[PDB]
Amino acid sequence: ALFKADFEDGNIGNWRARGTEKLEVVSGIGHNSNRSLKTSSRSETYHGPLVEVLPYLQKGSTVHISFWAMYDEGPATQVINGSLEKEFNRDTANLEYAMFASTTLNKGQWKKIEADIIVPAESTGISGLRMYAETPWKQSSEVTETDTIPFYVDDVQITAT
């Protein structure tokens, strides 16, 4: 593993919110385990747990990212996405975003989201690369309660290929 987060130590570490949402390491809920990272008070689809991973990785490499996700309120099914937030030339005002994977989850059931990703080369000027989870993109005016349900992540892992 290049990077692993199982939350079993109860530490938030470098995980962060993307807007006004709340992150919390909870106990009593986890993927085959007692702890996981809960994201709640989401009021946009793009709210979700984020972590910077570029320092763990070699620029110009391909790595395998996976994590487990679960939600337990609202609709019978819901899509969750795994996405990347990228920063180039330390320009915080010109970020880009890409979805790397997506699965449909069933209420109460843990499921794995995974894909190979490319870490852009040094010569791109890449200066941040953050993985995050969210619900499928759409804008503020179209946002509904099914979109902004709380959800859990666990067993986040990045591996060499």
Ligand X SMILES: O[C@@H]1[C@@H](O)[C@H](O[C@@H]2CO[C@@H](O)[C@H](O)[C@H]2O)OC[C@H]1O
Q: How far apart are CA 134 and CA 13, in angstroms?
A: 19
If the CB atoms of residues 1 and 118 are measured against ligand X, the closer one turns out to be: 118
Q: How far apart are CA 110 and CA 80, in angstroms?
A: 11
- Binds ligand XYP by CB under 6 A, chosen from 98, 115, 118, 160: 98
Q: Which of residues 112-151 bind ligand XYP (CB under 6 A)?
A: 137
Between vectors from CA 97 to CA 31 and to CA 149, what angle results, nearest 5°? Answer: 45
Q: Which of residues 23-62 bind Ca ion (CB under 5 A)?
A: 30, 33, 35-36
> Quick count: other Cβ atoms within 10 Å of Cβ 151?
25
Binding residues for ligand X, rule: CB under 6 A, are: 18, 46, 83, 97, 99, 134, 137
- Residues 6+ positions from 55 with CB-CB distance below 8 Å: none
If the CB atoms of residues 32 and 96 are measured against ligand XYP, the closer one turns out to be: 96
Which residue ranges make up the site for ligand XYP (CB under 6 A)?
97-98, 137
